[PDB]
């Protein structure tokens, strides 16, 4: 049963928060041996938080909006008393975190109940959650296939029914990709909306944080709970709260909605195109629109990511290169060796790019693209082919996500189920101008109401 029903069951007294917690714990116990989404279970904490909700309810209090809702978080998020792994072996010996990540604090204040931490590609550098140290996370819809990444555990935990809400990070696609491949909902908010404080970073210039969920209501509820300024967070630009929940069902009448072409069709396979097509038809979108400099946008993001990510880890690459993830360590090293001219040109190009994307959205409210070029490939896949072009599997999963995060535009990834496709899901990106998260969510809600976007529960 989904987020909204869980919340209502506790709120109305038909079930206790504690019982809902014990069910999720049992489900994780019975399923995670195979799925491998969790790297730690905060059992004692979850039971205490759930009991605390039951006590508030018994006292007659008005319960907060996520009261008793179970969740879990990508293990780059600080959890009080737990060592933040960020998918690494290297971090195991660091001191446990003194406090929760700010977003975890805000979910807690909203009454949500924390079940633990989730597997990821090491240090966030990847799109497949094939972690050499911790094992791959497996796609619940077909356990020989990848969950996507780097927030693989965040996607897989929801698709397996372990929890209804999770948190992930997205720099070049790492929320949108696992949402797409696992068939669940994802929201990458505007760059600078949600506080990054108390998280292990990857690329200072591009990291975003945000929720995945079992429904679009879950996205909106978790997003509103986490909203607000944080003056101690260098990357935060949001000066006030702009609630999405009260207008979630307002619809799309009168909005200008377009379908992205060029880059976003050339790097889309047959299933991806079919998903966009049906989402476009349902949303009344028929004009094909070109995104400015999409390929160059990807290139600049790619350049800045590798140098910032790589250099962040320079001291460790010098002294303990062998303790890094073998699938990405050489990518980090390539990043450190990139000429400084590449970095500076990419940063200068980003100004031009920002001007062009903001100008594009003076004419459009929502733009539609596929989230991944294909559905989930088999674990261990080295190469994929997209419309007759070979790409390495691991970078290529983000071809369609990478340009959009570079401009910082909010995106909802809506889960769809196209027909020529072995029963596997693929997601669609609903993209809006900076600060227009509620338009993304309004569009997702229309997709959900019609049965086009859904989970296979």
């Amino acid at each position: 049963m989904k987020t909204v029903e869980i919340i209502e069951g506790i709120a109305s007294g038909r079930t206790s928060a504690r019982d809902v917690c014990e069910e999720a714990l049992a489900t994780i116990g019975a399923t995670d041996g195979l799925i491998n989404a969790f790297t730690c279970r905060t059992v004692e904490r979850a039971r205490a938080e759930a009991d605390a909700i039951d006590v508030r309810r018994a006292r007659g209090e008005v319960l907060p909006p996520l009261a008793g809702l179970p969740y879990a978080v990508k293990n780059l998020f600080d959890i009080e008393g737990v060592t933040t792994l960020a998918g690494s072996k290297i971090n195991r010996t660091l001191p446990p975190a003194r406090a929760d990540a700010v977003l975890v604090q805000r979910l807690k204040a909203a009454g949500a109940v924390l079940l633990g931490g989730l597997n990821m590609d090491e240090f966030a550098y990847g799109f497949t959650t094939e972690n050499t140290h911790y094992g791959p996370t497996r796609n619940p819809h077909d356990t020989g296939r990848i969950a996507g990444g780097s927030s693989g555990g965040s996607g897989a935990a929801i698709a397996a029914g372990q929890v209804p809400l999770s948190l992930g990070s997205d720099t070049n696609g790492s929320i949108r990709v696992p949402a797409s491949l696992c068939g669940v909902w994802g929201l990458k908010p505007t760059f600078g909306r949600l506080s990054r404080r108390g998280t292990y970073p990857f690329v200072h210039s591009i990291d975003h944080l945000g929720p995945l969920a079992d429904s679009v209501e879950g996205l909106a509820l978790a997003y509103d709970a986490m909203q607000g300024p944080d003056p101690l967070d260098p990357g935060c630009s949001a000066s006030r709260i702009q609630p999405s929940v009260p207008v979630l069902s307002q619809g799309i009448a009168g909005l200008r909605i377009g379908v992205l072409g060029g880059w976003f069709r050339d790097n889309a396979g047959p299933a991806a195109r079919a998903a966009v097509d049906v989402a476009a038809l349902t949303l009344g979108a028929s004009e094909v629109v070109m995104w400015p400099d999409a390929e160059i946008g990807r290139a600049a993001a790619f350049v800045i990511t590798a140098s910032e990510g790589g250099c962040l880890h320079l001291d460790d690459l010098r002294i303990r290169p062998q303790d890094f993830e073998p699938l990405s360590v050489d990518r980090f090293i390539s990043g450190v060796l990139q000429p400084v001219a590449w970095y500076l040109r990419a940063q200068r190009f980003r100004r031009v790019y920002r001007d062009k994307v903001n100008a594009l959205f003076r004419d459009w409210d929502i733009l539609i693209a596929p989230a991944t070029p294909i559905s989930a490939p088999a674990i261990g896949t080295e190469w994929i082919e997209v419309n007759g072009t070979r790409h390495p599997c691991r970078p290529a999963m983000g071809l369609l996500t990478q340009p959009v995060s570079f401009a910082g535009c909010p995106v909802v990834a809506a889960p769809t189920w196209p027909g020529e496709n072995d029963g596997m899901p693929i997601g669609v990106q609903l993209i809006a101008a900076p600060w227009n998260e509620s338009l993304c969510l309004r569009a997702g809600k229309v997709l959900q109401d019609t049965g086009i976007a859904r989970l296979k529960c």
Partner: protein
């Protein structure tokens, strides 16, 4: 850059920054680097004049209210 130029650069740059690379690892690093070099070439196709500034410029302190 040619494959030979990439090889000489990976070797010299990795030594300079303190990450010495064994032969198989140097080859793997060059493979990733070569792919990134193409993306970097694509950046050069967008014209920038000297007054085209960085996306973000320093702020020494917030401007005082009044």
């Amino acid at each position: 850059m040619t494959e030979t130029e990439i090889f000489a650069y990976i070797e010299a740059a990795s030594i300079a920054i303190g990450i010495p690379l064994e032969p198989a690892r140097a080859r793997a690093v060059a493979h990733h680097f070569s792919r990134t070099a193409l993306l970097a070439e694509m950046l050069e196709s967008v014209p920038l004049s000297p007054e085209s500034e960085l996306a973000e410029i320093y702020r020494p302190a917030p401007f005082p209210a009044e």
